[PDB]
Design a protein around this ligand. Structure first.
Ligand SMILES: OC[C@H]1O[C@H](O[C@H]2[C@H](O)[C@@H](O)[C@@H](O)O[C@@H]2CO)[C@H](O)[C@@H](O)[C@@H]1O
Ligand SMILES: CSc1ccc(O)c(C(=O)O)c1
Ligand SMILES: [Mg+2]
Length: 514
């Protein structure tokens, strides 16, 4: 392979205690004589799938658990196999966060939730509601201070307000039912936008700016997680950590993350990685070394959490976590976050209205499942000759009309391209599940080139139907669903922006109408 044998390379995000983690690596190195290297690459969560796909990258990847389902689905993670005794050392619900399709795909490290952090010298009694913050900012501005600054560039930080009055990601998971465009989400984001319009916040505020402002005593409040407490300690700001404000009488609902460590499927060092994670890091001493660098939050290791739990900052973290919800770990989470990130930034800046911004995020978040519903149904009915009688469910009008349109347009495409498809198939030689995998790379290569239009998309899906018919004929009907998922994957990740701009499959229906 490409990853070196007999050594460990670990990647972790730059806002975490990577120096403390390096200490743990040194202790492992001292015992074993085996080199451990801790790195904190930029855009880590995007770099890992890029390099791991080629069979390269680190032996161990750290991130919140929401990204790991996508990694596992893409074949990038090893199943982990802790023995019963080790599993019993960590809280069951932390294991639940890293279970994907019935398998454990990472070691859980710690539970993270955003809290309200406030400067007790400026604001001894922090607001219980978001609604009182405009007036509070006016009081503070007279003193040369501001009420609240937090990172507006990452949707993680604005999510608790969006979800407060009823916004949600995926309905508990139906990846076709998304709640980012409902009345509650709209209310939450509008309030944020109004704060900006009324000069109580600045749309350009990012993590570094908000952190510097709070730690310099310029703003009374910020929103952040336990990793941020170390830098505040150093600043000597007199701070407290408490429950997030309510919105319209409802608790803010942070998305709860479990910091987790996965093992690269391509690593020749899986046993070394196991040893390091189970017997060095996930121990009282290992977590303490990391926690002393940047606080982890409520750790997954029971023995050590019983100590941390006595910390009021940790109690506050858990209180907020209990009002929030554990993030899904499904593969669509990345698309969801990118969609909502764009919506918040565009609404904040005025590039889009709140309504249009959240509409696009809805469409972006539902795109994979909506597309899969259509493509899967088309391929299966083409292969078998009979339609699926199951109700379409959520956004059923769109799915149904898109499928109707696809049948009508696809009929001609398959008829006209029949000879071309026969030739393509003979060259590719798709005979089983392994072949459909290889087919993906070919498609991502050819489909990326040239002007995008609905005609070309129908041709891609029509070839899919042609291949599905073939798979059925040679008694490989089980390969049709992974074929549909592969085509959907290619479509959605090469044409995402285009598709959202067309308003997804609604654009498709309108384009070919009558
Ligand atoms: O903003 C979307 C982003 O949110 C979460 O990332 C958090 C992470 O969980 C925290 O540990 C800390 O590093 O802050 C991040 C936000 O900047 C999701 O885990 C992540 O996948 C998502 O993109
Ligand atoms: C298997 S490559 C392929 C198949 C059908 C198509 O329509 C396209 C394309 O349009 O790029 C590519
Ligand atoms: Mg739109």
């Amino acid at each position: 392979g490409k990853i070196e044998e007999g050594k460990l390379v670990i990647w972790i995000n730059g806002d975490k205690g990577y120096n403390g983690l390096a200490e743990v690596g040194k202790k492992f190195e001292k015992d074993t004589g085996i080199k451990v290297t801790v790195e904190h690459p930029d855009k880590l969560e995007e770099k890992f799938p890029q390099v791991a796909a080629t069979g390269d990258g680190p032996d161990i990847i750290f991130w919140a658990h929401d990204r790991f389902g996508g990694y596992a689905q893409s074949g990038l993670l090893a199943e982990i196999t802790p023995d019963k005794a080790f599993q019993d050392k960590l809280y069951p619900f932390t294991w639940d966060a890293v279970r994907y399709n019935g398998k454990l795909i990472a070691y859980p490290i710690a539970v993270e939730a955003l809290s309200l952090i406030y400067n007790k010298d400026l604001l001894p009694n922090p607001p219980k509601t978001w609604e009182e913050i405009p007036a509070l900012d006016k009081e503070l501005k007279a003193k040369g201070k501001s009420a609240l600054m937090f990172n507006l560039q990452e949707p993680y930080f604005t999510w608790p307000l969006i979800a407060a009055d009823g916004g949600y990601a995926f309905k508990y998971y139906d990846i076709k039912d998304v709640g980012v465009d409902n009345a509650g989400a709209k209310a939450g984001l509008t309030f944020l936008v109004d704060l900006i319009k009324n000069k109580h916040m600045n749309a350009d505020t990012d993590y570094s700016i908000a952190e510097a402002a709070f730690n310099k005593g310029e703003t009374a409040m910020t929103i952040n997680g336990p990793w941020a407490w170390s830098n505040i300690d150093t600043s000597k700001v007199n701070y407290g950590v408490t429950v997030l404000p309510t919105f319209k009488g409802q608790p803010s609902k942070p998305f709860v993350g479990v910091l987790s460590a996965g093992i690269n499927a391509a690593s020749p060092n899986k046993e070394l990685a196991k040893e390091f994670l189970e017997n060095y890091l996930l121990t009282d001493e290992g977590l303490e070394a990391v926690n002393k660098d940047k606080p982890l939050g409520a750790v997954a290791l029971k023995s050590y959490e019983e100590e941390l739990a006595k910390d009021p900052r940790i109690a506050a973290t858990m209180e907020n976590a209990q009002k929030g919800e554990i993030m899904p770990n499904i593969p669509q989470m990345s698309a969801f976050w990118y969609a909502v990130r764009t919506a918040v930034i565009n609404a904040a800046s005025g590039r889009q209205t709140v309504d249009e911004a959240l509409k696009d995020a809805q469409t972006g978040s539902e795109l994979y499942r909506q597309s899969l519903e259509i493509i899967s149904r088309y391929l299966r009915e083409q292969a078998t000759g009979a339609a699926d009688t199951a109700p379409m469910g959520a956004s059923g009008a769109t799915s149904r009309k898109a499928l109707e349109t696809l049948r009508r347009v696809g009929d001609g495409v398959q008829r006209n391209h029949e000879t071309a498809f026969q030739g393509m198939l003979r060259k590719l030689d798709i005979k089983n599940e392994d072949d459909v995998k290889s087919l993906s790379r070919v498609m991502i290569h050819v489909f990326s080139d040239g002007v995008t239009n609905w005609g070309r998309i129908v041709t891609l899906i029509s070839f899919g139907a042609f291949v599905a018919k073939h798979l059925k004929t040679i008694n490989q009907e089980s390969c049709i669903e992974p074929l549909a998922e592969s085509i959907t994957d290619v479509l959605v990740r090469t044409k995402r922006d285009w598709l959202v701009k067309q308003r997804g499959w609604d654009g498709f229906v309108e384009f070919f109408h009558v």
